[PDB]
Structures are given as C-alpha cells and as structure tokens.
Amino acid sequence: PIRRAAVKILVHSLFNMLIMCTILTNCVFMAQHDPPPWTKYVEYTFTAIYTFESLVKILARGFCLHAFTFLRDPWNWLDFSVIIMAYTTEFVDLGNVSALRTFRVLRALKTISVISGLKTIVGALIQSVKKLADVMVLTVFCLSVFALIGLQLFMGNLRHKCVRNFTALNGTNGSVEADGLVWESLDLYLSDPENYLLKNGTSDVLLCGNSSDAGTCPEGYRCLKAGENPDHGYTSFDSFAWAFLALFRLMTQDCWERLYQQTLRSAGKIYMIFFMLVIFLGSFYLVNLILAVVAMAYEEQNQATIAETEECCPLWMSIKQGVKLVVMDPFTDLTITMCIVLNTLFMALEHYNMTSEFEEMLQVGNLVFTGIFTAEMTFKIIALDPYYYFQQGWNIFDSIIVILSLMELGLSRMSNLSVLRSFRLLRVFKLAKSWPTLNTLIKIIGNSVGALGNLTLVLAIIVFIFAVVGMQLFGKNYSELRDSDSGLLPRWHMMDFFHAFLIIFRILCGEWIETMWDCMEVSGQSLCLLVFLLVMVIGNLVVLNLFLALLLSSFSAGKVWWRLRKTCYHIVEHSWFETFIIFMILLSSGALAFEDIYLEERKTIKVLLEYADKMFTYVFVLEMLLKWVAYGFKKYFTNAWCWLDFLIVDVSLVSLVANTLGFAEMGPIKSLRTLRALRPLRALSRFEGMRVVVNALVGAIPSIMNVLLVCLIFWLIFSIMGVNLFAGKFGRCINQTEGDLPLNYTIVNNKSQCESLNLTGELYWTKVKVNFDNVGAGYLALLQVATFKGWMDIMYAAVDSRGYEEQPQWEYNLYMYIYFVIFIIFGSFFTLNLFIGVIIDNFNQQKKKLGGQDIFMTEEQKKYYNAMKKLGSKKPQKPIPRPLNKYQGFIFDIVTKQAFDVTIMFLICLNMVTMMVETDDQSPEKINILAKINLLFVAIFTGECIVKLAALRHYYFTNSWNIFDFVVVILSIVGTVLSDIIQKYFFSPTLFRVIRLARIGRILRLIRGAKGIRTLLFALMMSLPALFNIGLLLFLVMFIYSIFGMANFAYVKWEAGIDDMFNFQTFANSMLCLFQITTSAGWDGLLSPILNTGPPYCDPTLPNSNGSRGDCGSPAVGILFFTTYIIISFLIVVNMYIAIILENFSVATEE
Ligand SMILES: COCC(CCO[C@H]1CC[C@@]2(C)C(=CC[C@H]3[C@@H]4C[C@@H]5O[C@]6(CC[C@@H](C)CO6)[C@@H](C)[C@@H]5[C@@]4(C)CC[C@@H]32)C1)COC
Ligand SMILES: NC1=N[C@H](O)[C@H]2[C@H]3O[C@]4(O)O[C@@H]([C@@H](O)[C@@]2(N1)[C@@H]4O)[C@]3(O)CO
Ligand SMILES: *[C@@H]1O[C@H](CO)[C@@H](O)[C@H](O)[C@H]1NC(C)=O
Ligand SMILES: *[C@@H]1O[C@H](CO)[C@@H](O)[C@H](O)[C@H]1NC(C)=O
Ligand SMILES: *[C@@H]1O[C@H](CO)[C@@H](O)[C@H](O)[C@H]1NC(C)=O
Ligand SMILES: *[C@@H]1O[C@H](CO)[C@@H](O)[C@H](O)[C@H]1NC(C)=O
Ligand SMILES: *[C@@H]1O[C@H](CO)[C@@H](O)[C@H](O)[C@H]1NC(C)=O
Ligand SMILES: *[C@@H]1O[C@H](CO)[C@@H](O)[C@H](O)[C@H]1NC(C)=O
Ligand SMILES: *[C@@H]1O[C@H](CO)[C@@H](O)[C@H](O)[C@H]1NC(C)=O
Ligand SMILES: *[C@@H]1O[C@H](CO)[C@@H](O)[C@H](O)[C@H]1NC(C)=O
Ligand SMILES: *[C@@H]1O[C@H](CO)[C@@H](O)[C@H](O)[C@H]1NC(C)=O
Secondary structure, three states: OOOHHHHHHHHOHHHHHHHHHHHHHHHHHHHHOOOOOOOHHHHHHHHOOOHHHHHHHHHHHOOHHHHHHHHOOOHHHHHHHHHHHHHHHHHHOOOOOOOHHHHHHHHHHHHHHHOHHHHHHHHHHHHHHOOOHHHHHHHHHHHHHHHHHHHHHHHOOOOEEEEEEEEOOOOOOOEEEOOOOOOOOOOHHOOOOOOOOOOOOOOOOOEEEEOOOOOOOOEEEEEEEOOOHHHOOOOOOOOOHHHHHHHHHHHHOOOHHHHHHHHHHOHHHHHHHHHHHHHHHHHHHHHHHHHHHHHHHHHHHHHHHHHHHHHOOOHHHHHHHHHHHHHHOOHHHHHHHHHHHHHHHOOOOOOOOHHHHHHHHHHHHHHHEEEEEEEEHHHHHHHHHHHHHOOOOOOOOHHHHHHHHHHOOOOOOOOOHHHHHHHHHHHHHHHHHOOHHHHHHHHHHHHHHOOOOHHHHHHHHHHHHHHHHHHHHHHHHOOOOOOOOOEOOOOOOOOHHHHHHHHHHHEEEEOOHHHHHHHHHHHOOHHHHHHHHHHHHHEEEEHHHHHHHHHHHHHHHHOHHHHHHHHHHHHHHHHHHHHHHHHHHHHHHHHHEEEEEEEHHHHHHHHHHHHHHHHHHHHHHHHHHHHHHHHHHHHHHHOOHHHHHHHHHHHHHHHHHHHHHHOOOOOHHHHHHHHHHHHHHHHHHHOOHHHHHHHHHOHHHHHHHHHHHHHHHHHHHHHHHHHHHHEEEEEOEEEEOOOOOOOOOOOOHHHHHOOOOOOOOEEEEEEOOOOOOOHHHHHHHHHHHOOOOHHHHHHHHHHOOOOEEOOOOOOOOOHHHHHHHHHHHHHHHHHHHHHHHHHHHHHHHHHHOOOOOOOOOOHHHHHEEEEEEEHHOOOOOOOOOOOOOOOOOOOOOHHHHHHHHHHHHHHHHHHHHHHHHOOOOOOOOHHHHHHHHHHHHHHHHHHHHHHHHHOOOOHHHHHHHHHHHHHHHHHHHHHHHHHHHHHOOHHHHHHHHHHHHHHHHHHHHOOOOHHHHHHHHHHHHHHHHHHHHHHHHHHHHHHHHHHHHHOOOOOOOOOOOOOOOOOOOHHHHHHHHHHHHHOOOOOHHHHHHHHOOOOOOOOOOOOOOOOOOOOOOOOOHHHHHHHHHHHHHHHHHHHHHHHHHHHHHHHOOOO
16 A cells, blocks of 8 residues: 555655754744734644645554554654644634644644654753753752741841831821821831932932941931832742742852852841851752762763773976975965964954054055965965865865955055954964864864764754743733833843843853842742743753863972071970960961951051061061071972062061151051061961962962863954954943943934034033953953853943944944854853863872872861771671560650651651741731740650650660750750740841741751752761862951052042952951852942042042042952952862762762
8 A cells, every 4th residue: 555655755854854844934934923814824724734744654553453554753742732622722712711822832843753863952951851860859858948038037137227207196086197297007017118328329219227237327227127029029038938948049059149148138247147057058059969970860861881891397396396385384374373473463453443654554564465465375375285285184274265365455444344354363263273272172062063063953953942931921920020110121022032032041051040030020920930940940951061171172182607597496486485476476467357447546556566567577687688688598498488578578578668657647647557467478388278278379370370271262262253343332321420331322313413412511421431442441341241240231231332433322232242142152151161171180190199189178188088998887786675674665666656756757848848937017816826836746755755765775876866856956955945035135037036946956857867958968977178278268358458449549439349348348248249140140340430430420628537648449440359369269160069079979970
C-alpha cells in the first residue's frame, strides 16, 4: 500500500525542512499584538500541515495498541496535544476563557525535537536539575528559617509612617481629630494619605521608627504605625508569604538596597546585623552551593561522553619576486601592528565639543590610515594569486574590512552617520595573532556561536517562548498603568513584542522585581508571580549552563658594635616590643574613627588627638630606625613589606615637619594628611591570615592586568561606538521650580530655545550626570551597564536621544536598546568568562606549587582541617546500648524506636507550621489560641528529653546531636517563664522578640538524620576559616575606604542615595553605605551626589563647620573611590567563591 511510501516520505530531510519552515512561520505570526483578520488561511493552513505531519507518523508507525511504537516517545504527546487543542478551539467558543491563544505558543517548542542538537540538550538541561536536589531543599530550609526570624524581628515594622499630629477635640462622641480639617474617626485619618509626609526627592512616604537608632521625624510629625505597606503592599514582613518573597529577593540580591534602607530606617541601625547575615549566608554560600552543583554535573556528563567517544613572463616575476620580498619582512609586521595602535588612539579622541582643529585632523587622519591598509591588500594581492590569497583565516578578515571601509568614504555624501566611521574599528581585533588573551577572547565568542552553538539556540528559543507567553497573558492589562493624563504607560511594558523581549532580558540580567510589582497591580497576583518567577528559575539555569560550558572548554583545550647590633636584634626577638607595636597599630588605626563632622565641636577630645598624633609617629620612627640598625639597610630595603611602612612613616614625618616647623597648613600639605588613612595598612604584615590572602592576590596580579587590559580595549570599541552615537544628545531643559523632569519637546525643542526664554531665570540646560561625551566619560557609563546598577537612567536617556543639542523625546530612538543588549552579552557575559577562567587558572597552578595545600589558609589552620575532616569521613561503629535497670528496661526500647523518631520529627514540623501562621493585626481570639499552643509544644518537648533521659545516663550526652538538644529545651523553658517578667523592663517591644526567637532553634533540630543538609552544611564548617581570612581583608579594606570617605565626602548634598541616615557624616553612616556597595549594590545612587558641582544641582558657598565651605562633592576623587572599590570588592568576593567551590569539591568529590 502507501504505508511503505509513507515510510519513504518520513525519512527525507525535505520533510524536516518543511516542518521547520512551517514552525518558523508560526513563530513569526505569533508575535503580533492586534492580529489582523486576514488570518483565515494561516491559522488554518498551519493546522492542515500539523495534522498532515501526525498523519504521516501514524500511517507509518501508528496502527493499533501502540504502547511499543508511536506516541511512546514523550515528544509526540505534545504533537497530539497540539492537534486536539487546535481543532477544538477552532471549532466554536461558548462561555470559555477565550484567551487560549497562549496555547499556540506551545506549537513552537516543537523545534526542539526537529533540530537534532536541541532535543538532546533540552534533554540534559532537564537531567541537570535532578542533581540540584539538596541544594534546593536547603535553600527552602534556610529561606524558611530566615523568614521566621525576619517575621519575629520586623513583625508589622514596615508600616511605620510619619503622620501629621492629631488632637482629640472633646466635643463629639467618638474619636475625632483636627489639622485644619476635622476628620471623623482615628482610622478614617490614620488612613487618609494627605496626612503622611513625602520623603524628599522620592515620592514615597517616610518610614519612621521610635527607637533611638532610627529615623526621626520632622518637627510637626509624630511617627506611628498606620496605613498601607510601601511599594503597594508587597514588601512588608507581616505574613509568612510576604516574609518569604521579601527574603528570597535578598537571596537573589534584587534591589535589596531599597529594603535594607527602609527596614533600618524603621527598626534601627543595629538591625543591620540581620542583613549581613542574610547577604553572607545566603547570597553567598547558597547561590554558590548551586553553581557548584550545576558544575559538578556538566563536568560529569562531558567526562563520561568524551570517554565514551574515545570508546607577464619576462617581468611579472622579477618584481613579483619583489612583492613578496617586502611583504614577509619581520619589520613589515611591526609597521603594521603599530599602525593599528595609532588608529585606535586617533579614533578615541572624539569628544563632545571638538574644536574644529581637532575635527579636521581627525578626518585627515582616516585617509592616511585606511590608505596604509589599501597598500597592504594590493601588495598582498599582487604577491599571490587569488586562489592562495583568500585562505588561511586571516586574509579574508583583513580583506573585508578594507573593502567595506573604502566603500563608504566614497560617496562623500554617504549617508550612514556613524557606524560608517566605525566600520574601521574592528581592525582592532587584528592584534590577536600576537596576543594570547585576545585570541582566547575570540575563541570563546566563536565557540558559543558555532560549536556549543546549540545551547545558545535553546536559550533563544526559551526566551522567545517566554516573551510571547508573557505578551499574550499580560498585554491587555498594562493599558491601565497608562497615565491617562499623558497616555504614557510604563517604560517597561509587555504590550508589544519588543518591549516584552526586554522585560524577559532584564529578568535574565537580575532585575525581576520592580516588574512583578508592576504587573501584580494590573494583573492579579497569582499569575504574575507564576510567570515572572518561572522565567527566573529556568533562565538562570540556562544562562548558567551556557556560561559554565564556555569556560570549561578553554580549560579542557671599637669592637662593641658587633654586640650592640645583637642587643638591638634581641629587642626584635623580644616579644614585648613588637607586640606593643601591634597594639599600637590597632590603637593608631582606631583613632582615625573619631574625626567626624562633630569633633570640631567636641573640644576635650580634639586636643587629645593631637598629642597622640605626634606620639604615634614617634613610636614608629623609633621602630624604623631600630630596624635599620638591626637588620641593616639590605634586609629592610629588600623585603618590600618594610617598604610600605617606610612610605607611611615618610608621609607621616612630612606632615608634622611641614606643619609645626613651617607653621604651614597651606596648599596641599593638609591633603597629604588625608593620607593618614592608610595607617591601617601597617596591619597586613602583622596578621598571618591577612598575609596569606594578600600573597595569593598578589600572585594573580600579572594575569589580572592582561584580562583587565583586553576588557579595556574591547570596551574601547563599545565606548567609541557610544561616543559616536550619543554625543551631545543627553542634555535636557529643566524649569527647576516645577521640577527635575524635562519640559515637553513642543514647548522647548532646541538649546537655542532653552536659552531664549530665560526672561525669568528658572530654566537650566543640565546634562545627565553619567553620559557619553568623552571616551573616558564613556567608560564609566559602561561600568554602570555592565554592573547593572544605574544603567536604567543611561538607557532611558539614550532611547530619548532625539538628536544633537535638542530636547529629549519619549521614545524617539527605541531601538537603541539594541546597543545596550549587545554590550551586555559581550561586555558582561563574555568578558566575565575570561575573567573567571584566568583567575581560576592562576589559582589552580598556585595550589599545585605548594602541593596538597589550599591558598587562603595559615599553617595552624591546616592542622584543624586535617582533624576536622577526619571526624566525619568515617562513620561511628559499635553503638553498645544497654538495658540496665528493669525500671527503664521497658522504656529504653520505646525511646529508641524509629516510629518514636519520626513522630517526634513530624511534631517539629507541626510546630513549624503553627509558627508560620502569625500576622500583624491579629484578633484577641487568634492571639489567644496560638499562645496556648506554644505552651503545649514546649511541654511535649521538655518531656521528650525526659524519657530520652530515662536511663540513657551517659549516652544522652555523647551523641553530640542529643547534647545540642538539651540546650534548646532549656532556652525554651526559660523562654516561657521569662514571658511575664518583662513588665518591669524599659523599651518593652524589642527585648521580648529576641528571646522569642529561640523558638527557631527547634526548627534547626530537623537535620539530625537529614543527610543531604548534613553533608552540605558541614562543608561550610570546613570552609569557615578560609572565609574568615578573606573577610578581615574585606573589613580592613572597608575601614580604609570609610576613613577616606569621611575625609572628602562629608558635607555633600543629600539627594539620591546620600540621605540622612546613610550619609558620609560619621563612621557608622559611612560603614553602612559601604556595606551596600560591597555587593555592587546601589553604587550609582551613592556616587551621583558626589559628581555634582553646580549652580543648579548644588550650591557654591554653603557655610560648613570642619570642612569649611562648599556643598558640592568632587567628581575627580569620587569616581576613583567607587570605581576602585567596586573592583577591589569584586576581586575579593570572587576569591571567596573559589574557596567554597573548590572546598565543596573537596567534601563531595572526596566521597
Ligand atoms: C582543572 O582542575 C581544577 C579542579 C576544579 C576545576 O573545575 C572548575 C570548573 C568550573 C567551576 C565550577 C570551578 C570553580 C569556579 C566556578 C565559578 C565561580 C564563579 O562564580 C560566578 C557566579 C558569581 C558571578 C559574580 C560570576 O562568577 C560563576 C559565573 C563562576 C563559576 C560558577 C563558573 C564555574 C566554575 C571548578 C580542582 O580539582 C580538585
Ligand atoms: N536592582 C537595581 N539596582 C540599582 O541600584 C537601582 C538604581 O539604579 C537603577 O538603574 O534604577 C533604580 C533601580 O531601578 C535600580 N535597580 C536600577 O539599577 C535605582 O535605584 C536608581 O537608578
Ligand atoms: C474634655 O472636655 C473638657 C471640658 O471642660 C476639656 O477641658 C478636656 O480637656 C477634654 N478632655 C479631652 C479628652 O480632651
Ligand atoms: C452624638 O451624635 C448623635 C448623632 O448626631 C447626636 O444625636 C448626639 O446628640 C451626639 N451626642 C451628644 C450628646 O452631643
Ligand atoms: C506635635 O506633637 C508631637 C508629639 O510628639 C510634639 O512633639 C510636637 O511638638 C507637636 N508639634 C507641634 C509643632 O506642636
Ligand atoms: C511611638 O511612641 C509613642 C509613645 O510611646 C506611641 O504612642 C507610639 O505608638 C509609638 N509608635 C511607634 C512608631 O511604634
Ligand atoms: C516654570 O514654572 C513656573 C511655575 O509653574 C511657571 O510659572 C513658569 O512660567 C515656568 N517657566 C517656564 C517658561 O517653564
Ligand atoms: C506636549 O504638549 C502637547 C500639547 O502642548 C501634547 O500634545 C503632548 O502630548 C505633550 N507631550 C508629552 C507627552 O508630555
Ligand atoms: C530649533 O527649533 C526652533 C523651532 O522650535 C527653530 O526655530 C530654531 O531655529 C532651531 N534651532 C536650531 C538649533 O537650529
Ligand atoms: C537661564 O537664565 C538664567 C539667568 O539668571 C541663568 O542663570 C540660567 O543658567 C539660564 N539657563 C540657561 C541654560 O541659559
Ligand atoms: C527634607 O527637606 C527639608 C527642607 O526644609 C530639609 O530641611 C530636611 O532636612 C530634608 N530631609 C531629608 C532627610 O532629606
């Protein structure tokens, strides 16, 4: 029959090509918002094609009872699904959802089985997850524990608001209040929102706690607890769901700076210990436990798979001879490499307001420089025939660019304004043959595009599917978020396809929240959370699998002088002298923390400092001189540890020699004294842990300068592109009084119109703080987009680039989001891959040199590791239980049963769920039932210990898990007892909660027997000393940068991220600000006030106490402080990741 012909038609590749074309046509047609009704054919033709494909399959391998053949393969289930859904829907619709268009999106996941590579990858991305199992359960366990702790500590503590004062009236029957307007009912008032105060600058409402360490309210405002939680109600810690989402955002580090700042501004600055604990414990150890598990697997499958894979005639010549003769000369190569360098430099000299001299030469520069290349190609064309000239993989390269460039310059009236110039740019890549690191950077782009080019295809398919699903589900709704005043919807919407692609990308780049929040207000919470969080788990898994993979691939492929010297050697050998020095170093360092804006007026201390200042230097000088004698000039000048102390004491001596003698406080001499900030640095030598860490970091310096260099050139391409695109297009008019937002483009469109309507001086043409005007000014902005912090203001201004020297417009240049999309993959994803690989390699080799020994670890810490590891590498053997007394001879058998263990372990889960039910604003009846139950529970538990103690005299204690337990119950028995004792105690709300929190300890009791957590948590215990050595280095570094910040960044305007409680006006406020920045969080808000010197935006001549005048921060030093810190912090936190990853690969791999 035709079945045998159906099999023939089944095996052809034309069938697969037709199926792929139909699927791609469907994908293109599905991305259209208001589909047109011409679709009588298409929805129907497709349905015909997809029915025909299933017909071909069932005719060839269908028949009857096909458990063995058709439909057995899991993928064909999708196909049948598609056909049934299709017909049912196309038939009629009566009282249904009718938004079942989203079901068609599933038709496009059929590409997976056809393109052959896709099916296997989506097969193995799925098997990866199966290995991240424990990690996902510990994630849930730790998230629940921290959610309970946050619930108890900040129960309803996010609602506090500064509200206008009220009085009670006493002329009306119920609670009545007044403030120029009588308002019936307290709650009618504590609710209305014209009675709350707007935080300066932001549009929020102030959050104000009553504790001393917390926000204080303005004069006419009392600070209470009434109203609706910030950010529309999704941030409060009132309920366990809201204390789980708001703490999972802390795990993923999404806008955690906003919650940190609001939480503390209501509960107090001491409560920053909780945040630190969440950020270290979870964001770091957890995220990394997952990356290591995802990695443990990729290697395993590739290792098994690779292993299993193993298992003219007169004269053309005399001068043709000549043409080659010039071409191959070694010096012919030098002229060339160098001419490349000059071009990049010549190019990177465009700027915003070039004087015409800089401009004409810039043109007279390209001609010469492109020309040199024309001679290189023609000579190289005359050298050999075109058969041999278009090969080897680097002649073609050159050939195209040379060709493209010549092309455009020719019209002279040529239209492309910029790329046209930057076509030349790619030449920079040519330095590759010479540069191993640029060669490695190119090989990675190539690998991802071509070889493991199936993973990126899978990622693109997933992103497309998620974008179309989100658009279809949520597009209709976002029309309300539209301001009907301006018909302006959000900048992030999902109404159209592109706008959607971007929300899906943002979610990939880390920024998922501000969007659930803006979609849960138009769409209803249940779905928004379901979809916008679905993109996350899958996506971050795919983006990570592609990344880990690219990396792995590169890896796979008088005679008394001689005794006077010894008598001063012995004082060095005497412990007491240098210990004095060590203490003197700490004290010396500390005394820096007291110089705040208020020391000027703390007289009794100001002076104390100075006596000490002097003595401090002397104790040291006596020490430098003592050393020079004891070890001589050789050892002191050759160790490079004494060199740092030498420079520090040099500048310290210059300070007092110029000041006291010279009576000179003029010019930069005081600026030299802002460098006493480094007195902390004396310490790095002294403490061994900080020392092994700094040695490990120094050993990696040569590679880091190369990796930092390639980025610098690569971002040079992006920076010159950005300068060429957005030069002079970031300036916007502002009416000042009315506000900080550009005026409309219809009212004022050109700068010539901006400065022609200033009859009343309110209009200021102010550029964006971070913009594209210089090549160097470009690189900051790129640091903001590449770190993802502050990038939104740059992206919102580039898209509005209406043109040169003219007002911005709302979305004139929408597609420039593409530039930003391109930089981020190459600039953030690929450059980072190189960074991580090289760091790992240097590290890998160092470990080998000192074989069997991690870096980041002292000698004494070694021996701990050695014993600690031994304890849990071997299980205990020989329990030896004894009946003992007949009195307990029938109790000890019951206490040891497995049934007893599981019922206890499930009573702990019952306690867990009865804990999860708390909430703010609970009725007396609820509060009441719940507390009685808490008493019941303590009781069962006290008892359990008791029977466990029946005759288990010695072994209750030696279990080391049982011993942990007594403590828990005692804390608990006390806890209940301590309950009514608080009455004679001050500040009653916060003493209580903390003792309540001991209840969580039971929660921690579940893991005696849950092995998965036990190995995984044990690991941290083995890694704890390494993290510590690095931590001290982070701290010493924070102090040094904190002192530097208070030196210059005090008295800066308070706007953006410098606000009253987080400012650089003292030590505590300075160190709080650094804590956010150490995670690169919110670092543009900190810096924007610094980079502000201006008649608008700041004010010259404010009168200031200590710093004496000026209210405007300095950009030149501020840009250096933050930019240097972001990098110093990056390299130090990255160091930690390796410490865990290798060590988690030391506990798991070992077993
Ligand atoms: C060759 O023999 C050496 C061997 C171990 C070598 O295997 C390596 C495989 C890659 C892997 C898992 C390793 C260490 C760091 C891991 C990285 C930490 C980074 O952290 C992240 C997340 C946070 C971001 C800031 C960027 O960096 C990831 C992208 C990066 C990461 C997860 C990419 C994958 C890396 C181990 C030792 O055997 C005993
Ligand atoms: N996860 C985020 N980290 C950034 O610190 C935040 C700042 O920068 C940014 O561009 O806009 C605001 C906020 O949305 C940000 N989101 C964006 O990155 C911001 O508060 C001020 O700009
Ligand atoms: C109640 O009314 C009396 C009238 O004499 C007034 O003096 C008193 O202050 C009022 N009390 C309150 C609660 O305001
Ligand atoms: C309380 O309000 C009621 C309703 O208007 C009013 O009738 C009554 O007089 C009030 N109480 C007094 C005694 O003022
Ligand atoms: C408002 O009442 C508060 C209550 O603490 C009080 O401190 C403040 O002085 C009052 N404001 C004015 C201006 O009276
Ligand atoms: C602050 O204190 C006042 C007086 O104790 C009290 O009325 C108010 O409830 C408190 N508000 C807050 C912020 O809890
Ligand atoms: C600026 O705003 C003020 C106050 O609204 C208004 O009166 C003034 O005309 C505005 N100036 C311009 C030209 O925008
Ligand atoms: C600018 O004003 C014009 C009318 O003056 C208005 O049509 C336009 O929408 C305004 N632009 C915006 C979006 O502010
Ligand atoms: C800017 O636009 C105005 C019209 O709004 C026009 O008259 C003016 O001459 C233009 N100036 C420039 C920069 O060409
Ligand atoms: C507007 O005119 C005032 C005159 O006081 C001036 O200070 C302000 O800078 C002007 N703005 C511009 C950009 O001309
Ligand atoms: C807010 O602005 C007012 C203006 O009077 C200022 O005095 C106040 O200190 C500012 N508060 C903060 C914290 O920005």
